[PDB]
């Protein structure tokens, strides 16, 4: 059998009891730390907590040799594949389950807290979020913009936008909410849809999962230069607020009391 | 100090290690099972795993008296507030942190798996979900249908719509995917907007969190009367599929081959 087990958001403890119970009694343990950053732990602590040796795999080992490195062992033993947060959220690991099927391997998913639901601690109603997007680093003469249209589309409907920030694990590069805002501003001049400016209200959630995450709401002009701590970060562009969402942003995220005055 | 700790998705093992340890160091432990129930376990088993007695709070005990029942103790003690899923996902829970602030009480959030990220196991891409909704039971002269317009607006833009099904927590009466489909067909007959029909494709997820969840995909006309096992049930109406999504539904969720040409 094959086990996809999420490790959670911040540290090793963010794993579900079920996850740890099963990880402990597995023959082989593999993992990847390229889809996200667990800024609160080390491979050692995970290994010490699990009680097994962990073979960390690269994006390539996975995307090209999952069935060559992991699956073979899964037909004779109980093998676990570990990932940050929930293993099937904002990743392409879901497809790996098909590889397992075609390989004669039974696979199970043990969920864990994901950043996709952790946004609830921002005060924004989770059901009000619309389509999601990723702000990707520009590479060479290629400048990604799609995520800008996502914000626009949701904005018209009154919905919130969750922006997954880019990550270059191998270069130990983790995009900050600031870089994301600087990129959006640049796309705003390029497109001029009045979708993202200095006056746009944004929400920053940094290091969710830690007992002391950074939750900040405010205008780009004021937050674009603010220090939100070490990564990972996520950026949120709220749609039409609800009075209680606004009260939470002000009371808990330190937003300008003037946002309380919702323009229904 | 008080802790909002998520209980997870299905059973008492879905709580995170961090959540279980903290709940054990708490002087008092409250829990609510009105926003949702844990069908994979019991209050007795959760009480035993933590090794603390747990006082259950009704919907009114919380929404009306949270500050007179839970917060008082949090002054000279460490209190735990357990909820199914991930904390603050339930819409009225985030405002409780404002109550905690108002009362001079520090609050921390201990995340856990939520259905919002767990639906990833359907093989649908998270970022493609739009606004979410709850299918409510008609009753008396009230026949709510806004959840239909959500499916309409989401699908229109190629987005998946996550549908929470009704629940009468106290009476422990869940709405089945079947009843939800019957209801939608009935609503389509009302508004006739070509949103939900016998030919519409849907995905039914039952018992997320369990090692053996029920994942089924197919046309309403073939699922409207299928048995998906015991509750809870989540209904999902996908927009235009990504080929990789369709193959997953065909391979893992038992969807018909027809979707590889019809819904891609
Ligand atoms: N604890 C955390 N705090 C803030 N952002 C986080 C985060 N975990 C993930 N992210 C965000 O999501 C990106 C990884 S996307 C993969 C998400 C992961 N499977 C999950 O379930 O969370 C990061 O670059 C960051 O922008
Ligand atoms: Na969503």
XYZ file of C-alpha atoms and ligand atoms in Angstrom:
555
model
C 0.000 0.000 0.000
C 0.928 3.649 -0.763
C 0.342 6.471 1.785
C 0.147 10.174 0.909
C 0.440 11.947 4.258
C 0.415 15.697 4.786
C 2.677 17.159 7.461
C 0.671 20.319 8.065
C 1.454 24.032 7.974
C 4.329 25.028 10.283
C 6.082 22.257 12.221
C 6.090 18.460 12.540
C 3.362 18.628 15.179
C 0.953 19.999 12.586
C 0.490 16.394 11.481
C -2.775 14.554 12.270
C -2.609 11.815 14.904
C -3.722 9.376 12.209
C -0.912 10.593 10.010
C 1.737 9.988 12.655
C 0.260 6.657 13.762
C 0.511 5.351 10.200
C 3.828 7.015 9.375
C 5.364 5.324 12.421
C 4.298 1.858 11.283
C 5.420 2.253 7.661
C 8.350 0.372 6.140
C 9.667 3.144 3.902
C 9.262 6.903 4.237
C 9.649 9.403 1.391
C 8.897 13.134 1.270
C 9.152 16.314 -0.791
C 9.664 19.859 0.443
C 9.435 21.777 -2.788
C 5.717 22.504 -3.039
C 5.757 24.558 0.143
C 7.719 25.766 3.150
C 7.316 24.462 6.710
C 9.164 27.364 8.337
C 8.846 25.851 11.782
C 10.649 22.520 11.578
C 13.582 20.509 10.218
C 13.900 17.149 8.474
C 15.520 15.960 11.680
C 12.506 16.740 13.860
C 10.174 15.068 11.403
C 12.444 12.019 11.398
C 12.791 12.099 15.176
C 9.015 12.422 15.562
C 8.199 9.683 13.068
C 10.957 7.332 14.184
C 11.983 6.580 10.615
C 14.626 7.674 8.116
C 13.152 10.012 5.517
C 14.305 10.023 1.920
C 13.571 13.518 0.641
C 12.851 13.570 -3.106
C 13.254 16.403 -5.641
C 10.559 17.718 -7.991
C 12.200 15.733 -10.748
C 12.596 12.473 -8.807
C 8.841 12.802 -8.267
C 7.458 14.238 -11.503
C 9.521 11.788 -13.550
C 10.407 8.851 -11.325
C 7.680 8.450 -8.758
C 6.873 5.006 -10.186
C 10.585 4.226 -10.481
C 11.656 5.247 -6.987
C 8.612 4.854 -4.745
C 5.838 2.713 -6.247
C 7.992 -0.426 -6.668
C 8.462 -0.697 -2.890
C 4.757 -0.027 -2.305
C 3.705 -3.364 -3.785
C 5.702 -5.257 -1.148
C 5.707 -2.854 1.793
C 3.720 0.004 3.321
C 5.376 3.132 1.931
C 4.631 6.711 2.945
C 5.087 9.891 0.883
C 5.109 13.066 2.984
C 4.295 16.622 1.887
C 3.679 20.021 3.557
C 0.054 20.943 4.313
C -2.537 18.716 2.636
C -0.799 16.580 -0.055
C -3.426 17.177 -2.779
C -3.981 20.929 -2.413
C -2.331 23.266 -4.929
C -0.028 20.485 -6.076
C -0.175 17.912 -8.827
C 0.293 14.917 -6.498
C -3.313 13.847 -7.155
C -2.153 12.459 -10.508
C 0.421 10.335 -8.689
C -2.502 8.273 -7.381
C -3.242 7.201 -10.954
C 0.371 6.109 -11.335
C -0.149 3.990 -8.236
C -3.316 2.451 -9.635
C -1.758 1.540 -12.960
C 1.101 0.048 -10.918
C -1.135 -2.303 -8.939
C -0.729 -0.202 -5.805
C -3.451 0.732 -3.334
C -3.069 4.327 -2.110
C -4.593 6.295 0.758
C -4.604 9.992 1.556
C -4.145 11.222 5.128
C -5.072 14.914 5.107
C -3.501 17.695 7.161
C -4.168 21.386 7.688
C -3.792 23.310 4.429
C -3.185 27.015 3.845
C -6.373 26.927 1.707
C -8.550 26.642 4.808
C -6.194 28.348 7.245
C -7.262 31.612 5.622
C -10.273 31.448 7.928
C -8.115 32.965 10.660
C -8.032 36.181 8.589
C -11.679 36.834 9.399
C -12.830 36.544 5.807
C -15.697 34.127 5.284
C -14.182 31.087 3.639
C -17.184 30.429 1.365
C -16.848 33.891 -0.139
C -13.517 33.095 -1.787
C -13.803 32.655 -5.550
C -11.235 31.260 -7.988
C -7.662 31.051 -6.644
C -4.313 31.892 -8.235
C -0.542 31.877 -7.898
C 1.670 34.937 -8.360
C 4.642 33.526 -10.269
C 8.151 34.992 -10.446
C 8.919 36.381 -13.893
C 11.625 34.352 -15.627
C 13.625 35.935 -18.426
C 11.466 37.863 -20.857
C 8.377 35.977 -19.670
C 6.106 37.949 -17.331
C 3.100 35.937 -15.961
C -0.133 37.920 -15.505
C -3.122 35.528 -15.397
C -3.455 35.887 -11.621
C -4.366 39.533 -12.259
C -7.473 38.557 -14.222
C -8.486 36.128 -11.484
C -8.548 38.983 -8.968
C -10.548 41.030 -11.446
C -13.111 38.310 -12.125
C -13.679 37.633 -8.416
C -13.811 41.354 -7.610
C -16.805 41.877 -9.944
C -18.681 39.044 -8.241
C -17.810 40.396 -4.794
C -15.672 37.357 -3.946
C -12.300 37.065 -2.186
C -9.093 36.056 -3.958
C -6.497 33.739 -2.457
C -3.045 34.255 -3.946
C -0.557 31.440 -3.501
C 2.899 33.032 -3.610
C 5.707 31.519 -5.694
C 8.404 29.166 -4.393
C 11.788 28.067 -5.778
C 12.735 25.406 -3.228
C 16.104 24.574 -4.799
C 17.115 28.240 -4.735
C 15.646 28.561 -1.249
C 13.462 31.360 -2.703
C 10.126 32.114 -1.047
C 8.095 35.012 -2.464
C 6.985 37.606 0.085
C 3.636 39.403 0.110
C 5.672 42.506 -0.718
C 7.216 41.062 -3.891
C 3.723 39.870 -4.831
C 2.344 43.377 -4.408
C 5.225 44.929 -6.384
C 4.489 42.462 -9.196
C 0.769 43.184 -9.170
C 1.353 46.932 -9.274
C 3.544 46.453 -12.327
C 0.835 44.403 -14.052
C -1.652 47.141 -13.142
C 0.289 49.695 -15.189
C 0.598 47.182 -18.006
C -3.156 46.418 -18.004
C -4.682 49.467 -16.229
C -7.932 47.744 -15.205
C -7.905 49.524 -11.855
C -7.765 46.087 -10.245
C -4.680 46.503 -8.032
C -3.458 49.907 -6.802
C -2.011 51.688 -3.746
C -5.566 52.094 -2.451
C -6.538 48.427 -2.749
C -7.136 46.640 0.563
C -5.075 43.461 0.967
C -4.601 40.838 3.667
C -1.337 39.174 4.553
C -1.080 35.876 6.382
C 2.453 34.801 7.221
C 3.513 31.503 8.770
C 0.015 30.179 9.441
C 0.177 27.225 11.798
C 2.525 28.875 14.246
C 1.004 30.122 17.480
C 2.057 33.599 16.418
C 1.366 34.058 12.711
C 1.318 37.467 11.097
C -2.155 38.607 10.125
C -2.274 42.087 8.607
C -4.876 43.943 6.576
C -4.561 47.334 4.923
C -3.871 49.442 1.860
C -1.071 48.437 -0.502
C 0.623 51.820 -0.157
C 1.003 51.108 3.564
C 1.737 47.384 3.520
C 3.954 47.091 0.448
C 6.948 48.215 2.542
C 5.966 46.477 5.779
C 7.950 43.578 7.236
C 5.793 40.480 7.752
C 8.497 38.158 9.022
C 9.998 35.051 7.472
C 8.011 33.146 4.841
C 5.871 31.487 3.726
C 3.397 34.279 2.964
C 0.111 34.390 1.085
C -1.659 37.450 -0.215
C -5.423 37.967 -0.186
C -7.420 40.564 -2.117
C -10.853 40.710 -0.426
C -14.023 41.249 -2.452
C -17.006 43.058 -0.921
C -16.578 42.850 2.854
C -19.171 41.919 5.444
C -19.373 44.159 8.507
C -18.102 41.333 10.718
C -15.272 40.508 8.299
C -14.313 44.177 8.486
C -14.567 44.241 12.305
C -12.258 41.251 12.471
C -9.759 42.827 10.083
C -9.668 45.974 12.212
C -9.821 44.310 15.647
C -7.480 41.400 14.860
C -5.484 42.270 11.724
C -4.896 45.929 12.623
C -6.616 47.437 9.591
C -7.532 51.141 9.165
C -10.729 51.573 11.217
C -12.183 53.317 8.172
C -12.738 49.973 6.416
C -15.408 49.333 9.032
C -17.514 51.779 7.060
C -18.541 49.233 4.433
C -19.943 50.746 1.222
C -22.866 48.354 0.730
C -5.264 31.995 27.349
C -7.643 29.947 25.238
C -7.087 27.685 22.235
C -9.379 27.127 19.252
C -8.441 23.566 18.302
C -9.656 21.790 15.204
C -10.867 18.232 15.625
C -10.351 17.315 12.002
C -12.630 15.593 9.516
C -13.924 12.156 10.515
C -12.674 10.494 13.723
C -10.788 11.256 16.942
C -7.472 10.633 15.214
C -7.971 13.545 12.822
C -6.821 16.058 15.438
C -3.233 17.236 14.932
C -0.440 16.251 17.325
C -0.056 19.920 18.242
C -3.786 20.045 18.902
C -3.867 16.961 21.126
C -0.890 17.959 23.263
C -2.203 21.483 23.887
C -5.682 20.211 24.680
C -4.088 17.928 27.251
C -2.373 20.820 29.049
C -5.648 22.752 29.227
C -7.509 23.183 32.486
C -10.913 23.196 30.803
C -12.167 21.797 27.502
C -15.289 22.846 25.620
C -16.539 21.424 22.323
C -19.380 22.092 19.924
C -20.834 19.668 17.398
C -23.614 21.822 15.958
C -21.692 23.277 13.033
C -20.865 19.649 12.273
C -20.625 16.129 13.668
C -17.813 13.605 13.561
C -19.460 10.472 12.145
C -16.276 8.460 12.470
C -16.226 8.764 16.241
C -18.059 9.626 19.481
C -17.823 12.179 22.288
C -16.694 9.294 24.462
C -13.768 8.437 22.210
C -12.622 12.045 21.839
C -12.906 12.493 25.604
C -10.769 9.381 26.123
C -8.046 10.325 23.628
C -7.437 13.683 25.288
C -7.879 12.413 28.832
C -10.041 15.359 29.828
C -13.766 15.726 30.422
C -15.386 17.745 27.660
C -18.357 20.024 28.102
C -20.511 20.271 24.998
C -21.883 23.697 24.098
C -25.065 24.169 22.054
C -25.408 26.680 19.239
C -26.939 29.158 21.663
C -24.390 28.529 24.426
C -21.784 29.771 21.966
C -23.439 32.400 19.765
C -25.133 33.992 22.757
C -23.050 33.176 25.839
C -19.512 32.374 24.706
C -18.299 35.239 26.906
C -20.135 34.011 30.010
C -19.360 30.310 29.647
C -15.926 29.941 28.019
C -14.038 33.242 28.349
C -14.374 33.698 32.138
C -12.238 30.624 32.840
C -9.683 31.701 30.215
C -8.622 34.479 32.585
C -6.791 32.433 35.219
C -6.692 29.206 33.179
C -5.882 27.680 29.800
C -9.105 26.749 28.017
C -9.623 24.692 24.870
C -12.496 25.125 22.415
C -12.827 22.106 20.125
C -14.675 22.211 16.833
C -14.963 19.737 13.974
C -12.819 20.528 10.928
C -10.519 23.569 10.991
C -11.207 26.403 13.473
C -12.649 29.661 12.160
C -13.982 28.023 9.015
C -17.480 28.065 10.396
C -18.692 31.527 9.497
C -19.576 32.898 12.938
C -16.478 31.523 14.727
C -13.940 34.152 13.705
C -15.989 36.805 15.551
C -15.501 34.823 18.748
C -11.861 35.907 18.681
C -13.077 39.460 18.853
C -15.004 38.482 21.931
C -11.839 36.964 23.316
C -9.976 40.200 22.654
C -12.708 42.383 24.191
C -12.491 40.281 27.363
C -8.724 40.648 27.707
C -8.225 37.023 26.709
C -5.423 35.844 24.429
C -6.460 33.375 21.745
C -4.452 31.012 19.554
C -5.590 28.856 16.661
C -4.597 25.214 16.243
C -5.526 24.177 12.713
C -6.679 20.782 11.497
C -7.996 19.316 8.198
C -11.082 20.924 6.679
C -13.492 19.660 4.027
C -12.509 22.742 1.980
C -9.020 21.316 1.348
C -9.968 17.665 1.767
C -12.109 17.775 -1.387
C -8.744 17.812 -3.124
C -9.026 14.029 -3.021
C -11.704 14.213 -5.711
C -8.907 15.036 -8.134
C -10.367 18.473 -8.848
C -7.844 21.341 -8.755
C -8.336 23.463 -5.629
C -7.776 26.804 -7.358
C -10.740 26.056 -9.628
C -13.361 26.171 -6.887
C -15.351 29.388 -6.838
C -17.950 30.542 -4.340
C -19.269 27.822 -2.012
C -22.812 27.233 -0.770
C -25.124 25.104 1.357
C -28.146 23.238 -0.032
C -30.884 23.906 2.526
C -34.079 21.883 3.044
C -37.242 23.653 2.025
C -39.726 23.992 4.888
C -43.037 25.733 5.268
C -43.441 28.585 2.796
C -39.670 28.815 2.494
C -37.910 27.301 -0.517
C -34.355 28.760 -0.714
C -32.528 28.406 -4.035
C -29.611 30.851 -3.963
C -27.257 27.843 -3.895
C -28.414 27.175 -7.439
C -27.345 30.619 -8.621
C -23.957 29.933 -7.085
C -23.587 26.828 -9.265
C -24.697 28.967 -12.191
C -22.193 31.784 -11.668
C -19.329 29.410 -10.900
C -19.911 27.054 -13.849
C -20.385 30.034 -16.136
C -16.752 30.964 -15.427
C -15.469 27.388 -15.564
C -15.324 26.954 -11.766
C -16.156 24.012 -9.460
C -18.921 24.616 -6.884
C -18.610 22.944 -3.479
C -21.991 22.138 -1.946
C -22.450 21.598 1.759
C -25.604 19.565 2.435
C -28.107 20.428 5.174
C -27.860 19.010 8.691
C -30.010 19.010 11.833
C -27.065 18.426 14.227
C -29.213 18.030 17.378
C -31.553 15.469 15.800
C -28.549 13.939 14.011
C -30.317 14.100 10.641
C -28.084 14.517 7.578
C -29.078 15.399 4.018
C -27.944 12.796 1.481
C -26.283 13.525 -1.848
C -29.413 11.965 -3.342
C -31.803 14.322 -1.576
C -29.521 17.193 -2.581
C -29.718 16.123 -6.223
C -33.494 15.628 -6.072
C -33.737 19.127 -4.644
C -31.571 20.679 -7.341
C -33.503 18.945 -10.118
C -36.575 20.414 -8.494
C -34.975 23.871 -8.439
C -33.879 23.593 -12.083
C -37.505 22.823 -12.898
C -38.359 26.096 -11.162
C -35.808 28.424 -12.785
C -35.048 26.362 -15.937
C -31.607 27.893 -16.465
C -29.922 24.727 -17.680
C -27.661 24.549 -14.602
C -28.501 21.235 -12.919
C -30.069 18.422 -14.959
C -30.046 14.655 -15.465
C -27.097 15.170 -17.783
C -25.150 17.418 -15.422
C -21.929 15.880 -14.103
C -21.437 15.705 -10.346
C -18.968 14.411 -7.803
C -20.047 12.927 -4.496
C -17.595 12.717 -1.610
C -18.552 10.799 1.514
C -16.602 10.361 4.741
C -13.532 12.433 3.906
C -10.825 11.789 6.470
C -11.614 8.110 6.631
C -9.101 5.686 5.176
C -12.002 4.435 3.074
C -13.892 7.496 1.737
C -16.494 7.180 -1.007
C -15.496 9.105 -4.130
C -17.969 8.870 -6.998
C -18.307 10.806 -10.258
C -20.964 10.581 -12.930
C -24.139 11.994 -14.383
C -27.068 12.937 -12.171
C -29.327 10.504 -14.041
C -27.089 7.637 -12.940
C -26.275 8.846 -9.408
C -29.580 10.429 -8.346
C -30.478 7.050 -6.836
C -27.090 5.552 -6.010
C -26.072 4.621 -2.447
C -23.037 6.521 -1.167
C -22.930 5.089 2.320
C -23.391 6.856 5.629
C -23.137 10.656 6.017
C -21.758 13.167 5.867
C -21.968 13.804 2.112
C -20.559 16.688 0.117
C -21.870 17.453 -3.368
C -19.726 19.059 -6.037
C -20.780 20.413 -9.412
C -17.596 20.795 -11.495
C -17.086 23.248 -14.329
C -15.315 22.297 -17.539
C -12.715 19.715 -16.533
C -8.984 19.754 -17.093
C -8.085 16.479 -18.827
C -5.964 15.496 -15.817
C -9.022 15.978 -13.579
C -11.264 13.819 -15.774
C -8.758 10.949 -15.870
C -8.598 11.026 -12.057
C -12.393 10.883 -11.841
C -12.417 8.020 -14.344
C -9.548 6.122 -12.718
C -10.113 6.825 -9.006
C -13.719 8.002 -8.632
C -15.246 5.494 -11.027
C -16.558 8.120 -13.453
C -17.751 7.029 -16.924
C -15.372 7.290 -19.889
C -17.934 9.570 -21.512
C -16.624 12.493 -19.437
C -13.264 12.415 -21.233
C -14.984 13.721 -24.371
C -18.083 15.444 -22.977
C -16.761 17.457 -20.032
C -13.204 18.265 -21.051
N 1.821 27.924 6.677
C 1.703 28.738 5.622
N 1.632 30.101 5.782
C 1.511 30.973 4.746
N 1.448 30.582 3.433
C 1.517 29.231 3.260
C 1.641 28.286 4.251
N 1.679 26.982 3.681
C 1.575 27.190 2.400
N 1.471 28.519 2.023
C 1.342 29.174 0.844
O 1.129 28.230 -0.286
C 2.323 28.080 -1.079
C 2.524 26.523 -1.278
S 1.222 25.941 -2.292
C 1.033 24.212 -1.705
C 0.084 24.236 -0.521
C 0.073 23.071 0.423
N -0.220 21.690 -0.155
C -0.984 23.295 1.576
O -1.817 22.398 1.801
O -0.902 24.422 2.220
C 3.403 28.800 -0.351
O 4.404 29.266 -1.249
C 2.588 29.909 0.355
O 2.296 31.002 -0.524
Na -12.950 28.179 -1.775
